[PDB]
Each structure stands twice: as structure tokens, then as C-alpha cells.
Amino acid sequence: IVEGQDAEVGLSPWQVMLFRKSPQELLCGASLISDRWVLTAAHCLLYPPWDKNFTVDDLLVRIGKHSRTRYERKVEKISMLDKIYIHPRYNWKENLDRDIALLKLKRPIELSDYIHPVCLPDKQTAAKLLHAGFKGRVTGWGNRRETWTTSVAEVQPSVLQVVNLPLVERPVCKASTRIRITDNMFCAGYKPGEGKRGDACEGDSGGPFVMKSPYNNRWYQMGIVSWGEGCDRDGKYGFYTHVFRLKKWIQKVIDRLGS
């Protein structure tokens, strides 16, 4: 998280972490939306240009961390995936439209203080809450700055980061990027005058953008950290999958069928 501050223990208890089986790296954030399923960005799994194609037996998942680095025995749970669900209409070879995947876990997972589901948005919560200037929250463990690499980079946190970021109107999103923006995407971030900065960045992809309703005091996931041209570049905005615009698909796979 560019311009992150350390998280309070317990702040994103739905935050899952994606990990390569061997050798051991963090690949993306993700969120626990049931005891059974993890939501994440499709690009965490299939991005062809970059040899990303991850088989179910190549990833395991981590729920309930705080440290990026050290296995917190007391609190943390490690599940392997039973199955993966990338969308059939995920358009990688153009603009990553519908960059959304799902992950079914082989165990059901056991909620703690520290392990707990976020709410999926309904109609009244999207319509009310998704407007320009309402800020929502981004978490994860990836870079605090843009990097190439050497033997590694330098810019990886100790602790889960937070930043809170305004949602950006569509004209100013469209206009920030050379790239074809769909009604399935939105952008967040501070406009150029606006004093504060902050962004997701490599490592934060897959993670949740959450918004808290003043109606019932709970959290809804509205975006998934999808993409950006750099990490927090002036003039450029952070791109996010409209989870709700795709609630169609999320329940397709979870109930097997049902529209």
C-alpha cells in the first residue's frame, strides 16, 4: 500500500493471502466472503503475457495474518484450494474486463476473532454508497513503493497496511488512462490538488475495497483491487472490479446455477 499506515490487529479479518506452494511467495491479496470461498482478481491466476496460469495444486491460501512474514501459530489458518473459478468473459488481451476469480477451499474454515467474512453489496448499498467523494478502504501486504527488483526490492511491510481512498467520478477515470474502461470497473484515488495520496500497488492485487454502511454498521465489498499504471502516479487512478456489477457471476458458481 503506497501511503499506508500499519493496521490494527484484527482490522480486515476477511483478509486472506495468496501463496505459491513452492517456492514460497505471496502473490495477491484476497478476501474471505464465506467459510468456503475466497474472492480475488482474475489476474492473480491467469495472466498469460507473464506466464501466470495457476493450477489448483500450485497455490495455497493464508487466512488471519497480520505479519506478512512469520507464521503466527496461534491465530492463522492455512487452507489449500479445492477449485478455482476465473470468469469466461475475463478479457485479458485488451483491458482486463471482468477481472474477477473465485476460489473454493477444500476445508471449511473456522472463524475466529481474527477470521471473519465481509458482506457482498446489495442494490441499496451500491446505489447509495458508490458515489464520487465517498472514500472506501484498501488493505494488503505488498509494496509501499513501485519497484522493478534486484535480488529482492525493499518495500514490503511487516504489517498489513491501510489507506482510505476516495472513489473517483467516471469522466476523470476514463480520462486518466489510455485504456478502455468498462461499466464493470471503477477507479479510486486522490485528485492532484487534494493534499493526500495513497494507492494499491504490486502485491495488493486481488485484495478487497470495502465500504462501511451507516445503515447497519457492517462492511461491504464493492471493488477488488484490479490494476494501475504504476503505484500512485500523479494523474493516474487505481483501477477496481465492481464486485456488485458482477454479483451475477459470483453466485453463478457458488450455487452452481441460479439465474
Binding site: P121, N216, Q251
Partner: protein, 36 residues
């Protein structure tokens, strides 16, 4: 998984349930009354 809410969902144990706001939560609640 459901839409709308699992009854338990999105209500964090250490905060929601424990009658406690976290540190950067009023930034959001502010962004709403300054919006509409």
C-alpha cells in the same frame, strides 16, 4: 455467502461487536456527510 448480510458478516469481532471504532473509520463517515 448471501447478498445483503450473513447476520454476522462484515461486523468485525474486535470493533463492531466490541463497541469500538478503529482508528481511520471517521475519515469514511466524514466523506459521506460532506458528500450526500
Amino acid at each position: 455467502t448471501f447478498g445483503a448480510g450473513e447476520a454476522d458478516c462484515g461486523l468485525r469481532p474486535l470493533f463492531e461487536k466490541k463497541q469500538v471504532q478503529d482508528q481511520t473509520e471517521k475519515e469514511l463517515f466524514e466523506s459521506y456527510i460532506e458528500g450526500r
